[PDB]
Amino acid sequence: LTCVTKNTIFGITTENCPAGQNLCFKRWHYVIPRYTEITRGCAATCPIPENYDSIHCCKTDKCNE
Amino acid sequence: NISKAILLGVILGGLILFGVLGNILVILSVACHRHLHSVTHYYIVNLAVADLLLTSTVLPFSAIFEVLGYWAFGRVFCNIWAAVDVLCCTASIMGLCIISIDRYIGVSYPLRYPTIVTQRRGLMALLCVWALSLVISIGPLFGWRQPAPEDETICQINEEPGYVLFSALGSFYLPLAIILVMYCRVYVVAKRELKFSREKKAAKTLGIVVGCFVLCWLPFFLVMPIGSFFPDFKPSETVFKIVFWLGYLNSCINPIIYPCSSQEFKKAFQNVL
């Protein structure tokens, strides 16, 4: 698997997943009313949401972006 | 934390009520005087209306976003709130650029000023800058937008750093450059060179307003681009909350500044009460 992780105006950053981690996920985080941080990366299992976060769980191929 | 929730609620309710009251007071004071009707006062009314609408729409909703911790309204309502937010946050600095141009022309030509900035020309500039604010607000986030997130509690607009960079530039830094250069000229002229004294007092008052605006809005547009450039330099939620509420409290501050420097504004406020 290859999940894109960090998105910048310079472009995207794609690196594969290590042993055990085989999913791509996207997680939101409520930093501030005008900047909701969004993280993305590999995962063995997409973590459950805590602290009123929210997570996108998908399969493969740098999906959802 | 119930204590944190109630503290945030009461503090932000006081701030928003005071901001609405102060901006309404400014509008009434300028409007109730026939003699005070000048193009610069019309620009001040524009700035006060922009701040008042920003307060009355965004500030309760941003405060609720803070206190609760998610979006409790419709997704289309989230889009409407965000669009109004960016519209007002840009129109405020646009009005500041307009008052900067007005005061530069007033300082340079104290007696030929009415023949350079006329009522029709002033209203033309006002309408043009409002239209430009509408464009630079609505276009960037809806003319180039990613698909909406699956969650109805997410209230972001565009997750691509290109949009945040372009919005930061076109809504703070170009008007900041214009205003900074033009009050550099104004300060140079005032320090080097009846009407002159009056318009110099007006220039000092609006310069204090502009300085407060710049100082209390710079941290926000300095910390968001830092995070956008390299995705590891978000210091903490603390600095983000502080800079955000500093900027919006700055949007609230101006009714304090108006009598602190302008004696005629203080007299108008005294009469209106």
Side-chain angles (χ1 to χ4, degrees):
Chain A
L1 191 44
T2 61
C3 303
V4 65
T5 61
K6 280 73 176 175
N7 189 45
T8 63
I9 191 167
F10 293 99
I12 69 169
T13 55
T14 300
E15 68 274 17
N16 53 356
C17 302
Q21 316 209 9
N22 295 301
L23 319 173
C24 299
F25 74 97
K26 163 182 290 272
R27 179 209 278 172
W28 289 257
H29 185 15
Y30 294 161
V31 194
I32 183 178
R34 290 188 68 184
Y35 155 68
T36 297
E37 185 200 312
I38 289 165
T39 178
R40 185 188 200 302
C42 293
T45 297
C46 63
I48 62 170
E50 271 96 340
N51 203 3
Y52 291 166
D53 280 335
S54 189
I55 196 160
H56 186 273
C57 305
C58 170
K59 199 50 187 165
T60 51
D61 273 308
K62 283 191 307 311
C63 53
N64 84 14
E65 291 297 325
Chain B
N1 201 319
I2 311 165
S3 306
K4 284 211 234 191
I6 189 63
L7 185 73
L8 265 292
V10 297
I11 278 176
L12 277 296
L15 292 173
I16 62 170
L17 183 63
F18 181 73
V20 176
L21 190 151
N23 297 2
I24 282 176
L25 190 85
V26 168
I27 301 299
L28 294 174
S29 78
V30 181
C32 65
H33 292 171
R34 297 292 92 191
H35 67 99
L36 215 62
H37 272 223
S38 69
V39 56
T40 307
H41 293 110
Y42 272 92
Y43 292 159
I44 288 168
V45 174
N46 176 26
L47 186 75
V49 174
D51 295 356
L52 172 59
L53 188 153
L54 178 137
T55 294
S56 188
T57 74
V58 193
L59 272 183
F61 287 174
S62 291
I64 277 161
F65 196 113
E66 279 284 333
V67 168
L68 262 67
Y70 43 81
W71 194 248
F73 304 86
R75 269 306 308 275
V76 65
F77 292 166
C78 167
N79 278 345
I80 277 166
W81 162 84
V84 170
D85 183 34
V86 288
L87 161 61
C88 275
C89 278
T90 318
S92 285
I93 203 155
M94 281 319 163
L96 289 181
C97 177
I98 301 299
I99 77 161
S100 192
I101 302 174
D102 184 75
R103 284 281 51 101
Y104 172 74
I105 288 183
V107 166
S108 303
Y109 318 106
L111 73 165
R112 321 166 49 198
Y113 168 72
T115 62
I116 304 167
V117 170
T118 78
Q119 272 194 320
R120 185 186 153 179
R121 294 166 90 101
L123 266 296
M124 183 278 288
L126 188 73
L127 264 57
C128 173
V129 77
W130 257 117
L132 188 153
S133 73
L134 294 174
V135 167
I136 307 303
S137 173
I138 298 314
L141 75 164
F142 303 111
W144 175 42
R145 186 200 62 255
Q146 95 285 354
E150 46 190 22
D151 303 320
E152 286 204 1
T153 63
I154 298 288
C155 199
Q156 79 162 354
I157 53 173
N158 179 323
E159 57 202 3
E160 311 295 30
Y163 167 73
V164 71
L165 291 202
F166 173 78
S167 177
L169 270 295
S171 174
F172 183 77
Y173 285 110
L174 273 297
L176 173 73
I178 294 178
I179 290 172
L180 283 193
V181 173
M182 185 179 288
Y183 291 171
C184 179
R185 291 180 181 177
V186 163
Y187 169 74
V188 158
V189 173
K191 103 163 181 187
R192 157 73 73 177
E193 311 188 23
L194 285 194
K195 297 316 178 185
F196 204 52
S197 86
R198 164 189 300 170
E199 65 87 19
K200 253 169 154 175
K201 296 173 201 170
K204 171 203 181 177
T205 286
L206 295 175
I208 295 306
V209 168
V210 165
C212 274
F213 188 99
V214 164
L215 276 296
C216 313
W217 262 107
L218 191 50
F220 192 32
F221 286 102
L222 265 191
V223 71
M224 311 215 288
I226 278 177
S228 164
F229 292 166
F230 302 101
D232 50 342
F233 293 100
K234 277 74 69 177
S236 68
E237 271 76 350
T238 300
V239 304
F240 280 90
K241 305 212 152 303
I242 287 303
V243 301
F244 181 86
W245 286 120
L246 178 64
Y248 283 66
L249 169 63
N250 176 22
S251 177
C252 194
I253 278 172
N254 298 325
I256 295 96
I257 300 174
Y258 283 160
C260 166
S261 306
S262 174
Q263 314 288 63
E264 60 165 61
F265 264 109
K266 183 59 159 191
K267 293 185 304 175
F269 289 157
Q270 278 163 336
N271 296 115
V272 73
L273 282 72

